[PDB]
Amino acid sequence: EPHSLRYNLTVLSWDGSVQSGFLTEVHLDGQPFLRCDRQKCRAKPQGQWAEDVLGNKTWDRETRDLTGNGKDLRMTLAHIKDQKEGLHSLQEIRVCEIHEDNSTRSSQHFYYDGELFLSQNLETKEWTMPQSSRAQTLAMNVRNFLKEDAMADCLQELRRYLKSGVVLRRTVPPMVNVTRSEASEGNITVTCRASGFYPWNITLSWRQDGVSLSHDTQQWGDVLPDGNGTYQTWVATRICQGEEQRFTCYMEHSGNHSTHPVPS
Numbered sequence: 374e375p376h377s378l379r380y381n382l383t384v385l386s387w388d389g390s391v392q393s394g395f396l397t398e399v400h401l402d403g404q405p406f407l408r409c410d411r412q413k414c415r416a417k418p419q420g421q422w423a424e425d426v427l428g429n430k431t432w433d434r435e436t437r438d439l440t441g442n443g444k445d446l447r448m449t450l451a452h453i454k455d456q457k458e459g460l461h462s463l464q465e466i467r468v469c470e471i472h473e474d475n476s477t478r479s480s481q482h483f484y485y486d487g488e489l490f491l492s493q494n495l496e497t498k499e500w501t502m503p504q505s506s507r508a509q510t511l512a513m514n515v516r517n518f519l520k521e522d523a524m525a526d527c528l529q530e531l532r533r534y535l536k537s538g539v540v541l542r543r544t545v546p547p548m549v550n551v552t553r554s555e556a557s558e559g560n561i562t563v564t565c566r567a568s569g570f571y572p573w574n575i576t577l578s579w580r581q582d583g584v585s586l587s588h589d590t591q592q593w594g595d596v597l598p599d600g601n602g603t604y605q606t607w608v609a610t611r612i613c614q615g616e617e618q619r620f621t622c623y624m625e626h627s628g629n630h631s632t633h634p635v636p637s
């Protein structure tokens with residue numbers, strides 16, 4: 374289950390002058406989350422979703438920081454020169470996703486009157502101009518100023534919302550446990566069990582000397598319902614003498630994997 378957070382800040386400038394107002398569009402995991410004034414953040418669908426659980430958090434912390442960046446961009450715009458007559462806008466879309474990889478990505482993009490003219494990879498800080506060119510000056514304008522004023526928080530936030538239950542994570546890792554069935558001549562029966570996981574597509578299987586056992590050598594348990602809406606299942610094969618050293622159970626679930634050996 375991948376996740377992402379995106380804030381869309383828009384700012385206006387009428388004939389050079391920069392308006393006092395501005396707005397932020399926030400989408401959590403690709404869904405309308407909040408909308409923010411200069412003095413308020415209103416929850417959206419997911420906005421409420423959350424609203425219940427914690428109460429109001431999609432208020433304070435947020436509204437505070439968003440306004441700031443707003444007032445900040447307000448300047449960033451004021452800064453640009455060739456402000457032709459009319460109503461114009463400058464948008465800064467900060468994006469950041471958390472891939473299955475558990476790996477991260479966080480960028481930020483700038484648009485003039487809707488046209489993307491400059492973007493940057495917040496992680497590696499690489500600037501980039503799209504397929505057009507003369508937006509360069511604009512890009513330069515912005516770029517420079519940004520630097521001048523100089524003379525994390527997204528993912529921070531994403532992680533937060535995530536961990537705080539704002540978004541209902543929908544994947545539960547299984548519990549693997551290898552057990553042996555004391556034995557005689559045909560020898561023992563090691564059994565690999567996976568429980569309490571969700572969703573249902575899981576991969577259980579034994580491996581002797583690294584190589585996967587054939588479908589037959591092992592016995593399979595159906596994928597059945599387990600605790601709190603989870604599932605559970607199992608796999609076993611007949612091991613001989615003291616050869617467990619070579620046997621290992623392998624399990625895969627929604628992209629995650631792990632190997633378990635035979636107890637002593």
Ligand SMILES: *[C@@H]1O[C@H](CO)[C@@H](O[C@@H]2O[C@H](CO)[C@@H](O)[C@H](O)[C@H]2NC(C)=O)[C@H](O)[C@H]1NC(C)=O
Pocket residue numbers: 381382383398462464466487
């Ligand atoms: C980012 O935010 C702005 C404001 O919500 C979006 O810009 C508007 O989008 C619609 C469709 O293009 C236009 O009719 C409006 O005139 C646009 N400008 C403004 C100032 O509202 C923008 O499309 C949003 N989404 C993205 C991906 O940038």
